[PDB]
């Protein structure tokens, strides 16, 4: 058989591969670079624009644009370059051969799916397509049918409660805190220690400081006192040029804004209170199964100690006879792709695809008809 593609556009990373594989063939940043300086040498083989690992490699010459932000595609001519690179250069497969599966954050604009569909059939000429809610796929990955899923990548965070494969749309919470807003906060706070980062090519440095050094405090105000009193907590990092920077009590302050969006001036409650309020909107027969199956998903949940901090601060809210368990598998950065990889391999699914014969009759609005 022709296996289908699974392509988790996400934001910030593209994850792609064939259904039935256990990890993606292609993981590269969803970033398009254009050169800003004057090219002076002649015969250099100048190239209009760079995608992914190239734009990361040459980033010092480039201006880097993400075409997707908050799970919304904001520039289609970039995004189509990213798909073109994914199919032809990175997977080295012609998409006209076999179906494609795409993933989207819930509750985002209706036109985004119509444009994705129109591009997939018109330019890439895919034989059939489907789009699937990421947080649903995270359950397929973690091997469950009853869950509440905190799925948090770059761009967007959302909670979806699912009971025995019935989703509860009225209870779906979406929040726009994400790895990119922890990064922009880490930029505005590192400045306290004099370090400075003003360009995209070094926003990509701060993005990797955040990944290695940052961690989540099990209780915030005592570690704030500790690392204000003893320097033993602070750690140091070599910038690309060889300068050494040092980061102390800061390296737990940026991921803790997930629990206090007030630090960046948002009104809304952190991931713990939005998780609890999402459970509270569910009807009371299912709350015990939701409290047991809290599933972490996506990369922004990778910070050390976010599991124990969640279990603590939800147990501070839950009724004390209940039992609260946070399921944080180590693969979890890929779980949306793994779930889509198994979903697309199910023989039952093969009916679900939007085929081109349907699209040519109904137009791109068919998605709202046949998808979720």
């Amino acid at each position: 058989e022709t296996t289908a593609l699974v392509c988790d556009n996400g934001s910030g990373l593209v994850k792609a591969g064939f259904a039935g594989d256990d990890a993606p063939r292609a993981v590269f940043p969803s970033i398009v670079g254009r050169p800003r300086h004057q090219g002076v040498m002649v015969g250099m083989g100048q190239k209009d624009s760079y995608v992914g690992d190239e734009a990361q490699s040459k980033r010092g010459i480039l201006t880097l644009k993400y075409p997707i932000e908050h799970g919304i595609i904001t520039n289609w001519d970039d995004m189509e370059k990213i798909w073109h690179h994914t199919f032809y250069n990175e997977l080295r497969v012609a998409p006209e051969e076999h179906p494609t599966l795409l993933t989207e954050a819930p509750l985002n604009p209706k036109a985004n799916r119509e444009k994705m569909t129109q591009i997939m059939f018109e330019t890439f000429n895919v034989p059939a397509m489907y789009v699937a809610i990421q947080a649903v796929l995270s359950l397929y990955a973690s091997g469950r049918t009853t869950g509440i899923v905190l799925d948090s990548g770059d761009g967007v965070t959302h909670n979806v409660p699912i009971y025995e494969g019935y989703a509860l749309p009225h209870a779906i919470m979406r929040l726009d805190l994400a790895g990119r807003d922890l990064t922009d906060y880490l930029m505005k706070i590192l400045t306290e220690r004099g370090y400075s980062f003003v360009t995209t090519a070094e926003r990509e440095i701060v993005r990797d400081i955040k990944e290695k050094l940052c961690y989540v405090a099990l209780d915030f105000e005592n570690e704030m006192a500790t690392a204000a009193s003893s320097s033993s907590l602070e750690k140091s990092y070599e910038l690309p040029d060889g300068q050494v920077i040092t980061i102390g009590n800061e390296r737990f302050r940026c991921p803790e804004t997930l629990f206090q969006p007030s630090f960046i001036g948002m009104e809304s409650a952190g991931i713990h209170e939005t998780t609890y309020n999402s459970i509270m909107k569910c009807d009371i027969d299912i709350r015990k199964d939701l409290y047991a199956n809290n599933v972490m998903s996506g990369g922004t949940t990778m910070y050390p100690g976010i599991a124990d901090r969640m279990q603590k601060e939800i147990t501070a809210l839950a009724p004390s006879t209940m039992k609260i368990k946070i399921i944080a598998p180590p693969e979890r950065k890929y779980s949306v792709w793994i779930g889509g990889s198994i979903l697309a391999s199910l023989s039952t699914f093969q009916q679900m695809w939007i085929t081109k014969q349907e699209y040519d009759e109904a137009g791109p609005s068919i998605v709202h008809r046949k998808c979720f």
Partner: peptide, 7 residues
Amino acid sequence: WXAXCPA
């Protein structure tokens, strides 16, 4: 987005 936020 189109109104509320910048995307």
